[PDB]
Design an enzyme around this catalytic site. Structure first.
Site, PDB file in Angstrom:
ATOM      1  N   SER A 143       1.155  -0.788   0.191  1.00 10.57           N
ATOM      2  CA  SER A 143       0.303  -0.188   0.200  1.00 10.57           C
ATOM      3  C   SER A 143       1.112   1.290  -0.185  1.00 10.57           C
ATOM      4  CB  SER A 143      -0.712  -0.455   1.659  1.00 10.57           C
ATOM      5  OG  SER A 143      -1.851   1.680   1.033  1.00 10.57           O
ATOM      6  N   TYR A 157      -2.270  -0.078   9.881  1.00  7.97           N
ATOM      7  CA  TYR A 157      -1.990  -0.675   8.780  1.00  7.97           C
ATOM      8  C   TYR A 157      -0.563  -0.514   8.117  1.00  7.97           C
ATOM      9  CZ  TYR A 157      -3.840  -1.004   4.132  1.00  7.97           C
ATOM     10  OH  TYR A 157      -3.868  -0.698   2.296  1.00  7.97           O
TER      11      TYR A 157
HETATM   12  N1  LIG Z   1      -8.258  -0.258  -2.334  1.00  9.35           N
HETATM   13  C1  LIG Z   1      -8.090   0.324  -1.678  1.00  9.35           C
HETATM   14  O1  LIG Z   1      -7.033   1.014  -1.975  1.00  9.35           O
HETATM   15  C2  LIG Z   1      -6.058  -0.531  -1.305  1.00  9.35           C
HETATM   16  C3  LIG Z   1      -5.153   0.177  -1.621  1.00  9.35           C
HETATM   17  C4  LIG Z   1      -4.089  -0.264  -0.788  1.00  9.35           C
HETATM   18  C5  LIG Z   1      -4.064  -1.085  -0.716  1.00  9.35           C
HETATM   19  N2  LIG Z   1      -4.935  -2.455  -0.855  1.00  9.35           N
HETATM   20  C6  LIG Z   1      -4.769  -3.985  -0.575  1.00  9.35           C
HETATM   21  O2  LIG Z   1      -5.462  -4.707  -1.599  1.00  9.35           O
HETATM   22  C7  LIG Z   1      -5.486  -5.207  -1.267  1.00  9.35           C
HETATM   23  C8  LIG Z   1      -7.064  -5.967  -1.047  1.00  9.35           C
HETATM   24  O3  LIG Z   1      -7.817  -5.381  -1.202  1.00  9.35           O
HETATM   25  P1  LIG Z   1      -8.845  -4.331  -1.438  1.00  9.35           P
HETATM   26  O4  LIG Z   1      -9.400  -2.592  -1.687  1.00  9.35           O
HETATM   27  O5  LIG Z   1      -9.321  -5.041  -2.428  1.00  9.35           O
HETATM   28  O6  LIG Z   1     -10.027  -4.494   0.274  1.00  9.35           O
HETATM   29  P2  LIG Z   1     -11.668  -5.270   0.527  1.00  9.35           P
HETATM   30  O7  LIG Z   1     -12.882  -5.152  -0.733  1.00  9.35           O
HETATM   31  O8  LIG Z   1     -11.750  -5.419   1.644  1.00  9.35           O
HETATM   32  O9  LIG Z   1     -11.370  -6.895   0.317  1.00  9.35           O
HETATM   33  C9  LIG Z   1     -10.323  -7.804   1.189  1.00  9.35           C
HETATM   34  C10 LIG Z   1     -10.383  -9.169   0.622  1.00  9.35           C
HETATM   35  O10 LIG Z   1     -10.023  -9.894   1.177  1.00  9.35           O
HETATM   36  C11 LIG Z   1     -10.306 -10.845   2.254  1.00  9.35           C
HETATM   37  N3  LIG Z   1      -9.470 -10.917   3.639  1.00  9.35           N
HETATM   38  C12 LIG Z   1      -9.645 -10.444   4.374  1.00  9.35           C
HETATM   39  N4  LIG Z   1      -9.080 -10.645   5.472  1.00  9.35           N
HETATM   40  C13 LIG Z   1      -8.795 -11.881   4.982  1.00  9.35           C
HETATM   41  C14 LIG Z   1      -8.315 -12.838   6.081  1.00  9.35           C
HETATM   42  N5  LIG Z   1      -8.447 -13.165   7.403  1.00  9.35           N
HETATM   43  N6  LIG Z   1      -8.122 -14.177   4.936  1.00  9.35           N
HETATM   44  C15 LIG Z   1      -8.463 -14.279   3.904  1.00  9.35           C
HETATM   45  N7  LIG Z   1      -8.967 -13.589   3.086  1.00  9.35           N
HETATM   46  C16 LIG Z   1      -9.365 -12.577   3.894  1.00  9.35           C
HETATM   47  C17 LIG Z   1     -11.375 -10.821   1.616  1.00  9.35           C
HETATM   48  O11 LIG Z   1     -12.411 -12.026   1.786  1.00  9.35           O
HETATM   49  P3  LIG Z   1     -13.432 -12.029   2.637  1.00  9.35           P
HETATM   50  O12 LIG Z   1     -14.520 -10.800   2.326  1.00  9.35           O
HETATM   51  O13 LIG Z   1     -15.048 -13.343   1.782  1.00  9.35           O
HETATM   52  O14 LIG Z   1     -13.995 -12.222   3.633  1.00  9.35           O
HETATM   53  C18 LIG Z   1     -11.890  -9.971   0.419  1.00  9.35           C
HETATM   54  O15 LIG Z   1     -11.659 -10.546  -0.105  1.00  9.35           O
HETATM   55  C19 LIG Z   1      -5.185  -5.933   0.433  1.00  9.35           C
HETATM   56  O16 LIG Z   1      -3.901  -6.498   0.827  1.00  9.35           O
HETATM   57  C20 LIG Z   1      -5.840  -4.354   1.102  1.00  9.35           C
HETATM   58  O17 LIG Z   1      -4.779  -3.605   1.315  1.00  9.35           O
HETATM   59  C21 LIG Z   1      -6.268  -1.467  -1.215  1.00  9.35           C
END
Ligand SMILES: NC(=O)c1ccc[n+]([C@@H]2O[C@H](COP(=O)([O-])OP(=O)(O)OC[C@H]3O[C@@H](n4cnc5c(N)ncnc54)[C@H](OP(=O)(O)O)[C@@H]3O)[C@@H](O)[C@H]2O)c1
Ligand SMILES: NC(=O)c1ccc[n+]([C@@H]2O[C@H](COP(=O)([O-])OP(=O)(O)OC[C@H]3O[C@@H](n4cnc5c(N)ncnc54)[C@H](OP(=O)(O)O)[C@@H]3O)[C@@H](O)[C@H]2O)c1
Lengths: 248, 250
Positions: A143, A157
């Site tokens: 991130s 985080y």
């Molecule tokens: N969106 C942003 O702006 C952004 C920016 C920088 C980094 N990120 C990173 O991008 C990655 C994806 O996040 P996202 O933005 O797509 O968020 P999201 O919409 O909240 O999706 C999170 C995903 O992670 C899964 N998950 C969470 N905790 C878990 C666990 N303990 N075991 C297995 N699966 C787990 C969830 O599965 P379930 O829903 O089935 O529980 C879901 O598929 C993450 O590493 C996040 O830190 C996001």
């Protein structure tokens, strides 16, 4: 015959976009999820109905036993592994550090850091030329928080993601000789449900005037960078990062 | 004025922390010597400081444990009634290994001391130093490592990751508390001659690696202490969110 890719947290957001793109590019995909079975099954169904190969597996990446079972299911269904995308991640309510307690730190590090370590470990055990593998690649999802620090939002985080950056460099240097490349993406402000999970559905809209490109990013944009790093086109890149942040 | 400033050094009983405490006690600080496994070393340090004319309080606390951290700072409140500087020095690592042999239990222990402990102490320090809470401001110095940049391949990627977390916490906390009078910075030591290398399984680690250090030798705990004290001092009044590497060019 297809290369096999595990995406942790494939049920929603960046992971879901990565899974669909990987299937379009010819990978067999393992869709790991935790709390959203139906979302993961719907993605599996979309991939399979179009002639692809997909397997949906519930596992909490923080839990060593669930991770063991997740990879055993891959062994049974596919008998190989070629790519791990360490995408599962989470954050908790926006806060100052002076209100972050030990229980919160444990939960946030458990999913974001321990889960990525544990999945990387099991992936090394399958990809490594030490252990019957053909080599492959790992892509961690970091991130921009690792660089910006998430002040007044979630320094816990941001620290978890700083840990991912250092693990990316260390693991890259450790397993290069075993046929495994290790890289990371650093997304900026990407339109997924994660911002709402921190208490702010409108976070991108609040911040977009300050993003150089003037808009939030998409999950598909992140997926493309992940897939590039996982692909043979990145054959001389290990220990590096693609920032997918619109200049943030 | 006549009253000393007050500095808490976590992990003050040995190594870098002990050198930092000894120097700070001669630099205008009454020192709180936090220890865990080495009470006798901490008490000897307290006596050494009190014989050099200084002021010191030794306090047992495992920084990984929120209850111990709360009591540690309450002990400071009772003895001194004030706080000016936190040095987040307590840290540890486990046996040299490859990542494929690092389990969840090890990750939890390593992050608990190195990361959670620094968060928890920083939290108690902010509550006291912040001008929003009636404090006078102050500073926090985190102790990171060149491992955050090098990755510690084939040794301890877990510890490298913990120190990467410290680097990001340093940046984020600096930005979060800048307007309430608290500066937050970090040192990144390289190969320093303390017992930590033996604790990882390799007492001769510096001798193995020194030919590759630009300066050609390991560093000393006193060298690190001087950088910590500089960042804590008013000479660093326009530095927050920054790092000083103390690594001989590594
Ligand atoms: N969106 C942003 O702006 C952004 C920016 C920088 C980094 N990120 C990173 O991008 C990655 C994806 O996040 P996202 O933005 O797509 O968020 P999201 O919409 O909240 O999706 C999170 C995903 O992670 C899964 N998950 C969470 N905790 C878990 C666990 N303990 N075991 C297995 N699966 C787990 C969830 O599965 P379930 O829903 O089935 O529980 C879901 O598929 C993450 O590493 C996040 O830190 C996001
Ligand atoms: N030496 C190096 O080359 C080097 C390089 C880079 C970074 N560092 C960092 O520098 C810092 C000091 O390390 P060092 O080399 O001086 O190590 P050291 O000689 O092993 O001393 C460690 C110190 O930390 C204390 N400690 C350990 N775990 C603790 C806990 N849970 N709660 C409270 N105190 C705890 C110990 O206290 P007790 O003995 O009383 O338990 C001791 O005073 C650490 O953060 C380390 O990561 C060292």
């Amino acid at each position: 015959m297809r290369n096999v890719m595990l995406i942790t947290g494939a049920s929603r957001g960046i992971g879901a976009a990565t899974a669909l793109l990987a299937a379009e590019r010819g990978y067999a995909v393992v869709l790991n999820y935790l709390r959203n079975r139906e979302a993961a099954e719907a993605l599996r169904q979309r991939i399979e109905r179009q002639g692809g190969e997909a397997l949906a597996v519930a596992a909490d990446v923080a839990e060593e036993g669930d991770v063991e079972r997740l990879f055993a299911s891959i062994d049974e269904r596919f008998g190989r592994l070629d790519v791990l995308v360490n995408n599962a991640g989470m954050l908790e309510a926006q806060t100052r550090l002076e209100n972050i307690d030990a229980a919160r730190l444990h939960r946030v590090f458990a999913t974001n850091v321990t889960g990525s370590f544990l999945c990387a470990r099991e992936a090394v055990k399958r990809l490594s030329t030490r252990h019957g593998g053909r080599g492959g690649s790992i892509v961690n999802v970091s991130s921009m928080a690792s660089r910006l620090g998430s002040p007044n939002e979630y320094i816990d985080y941001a620290a978890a993601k700083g840990a991912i950056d250092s693990m990316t460099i260390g693991l890259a240097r450790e397993v290069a000789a075993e046929g495994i490349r290790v890289n990371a993406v650093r997304p900026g402000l990407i339109d997924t449900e994660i911002h709402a999970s921190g208490g702010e559905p409108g976070r991108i809209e609040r911040l977009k005037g300050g993003i150089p490109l003037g808009r939030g990013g998409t999950a598909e944009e992140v997926a493309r960078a992940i897939l590039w790093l996982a692909s043979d086109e990145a054959s001389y890149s290990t220990g590096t990062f693609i920032d997918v942040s619109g200049g943030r």
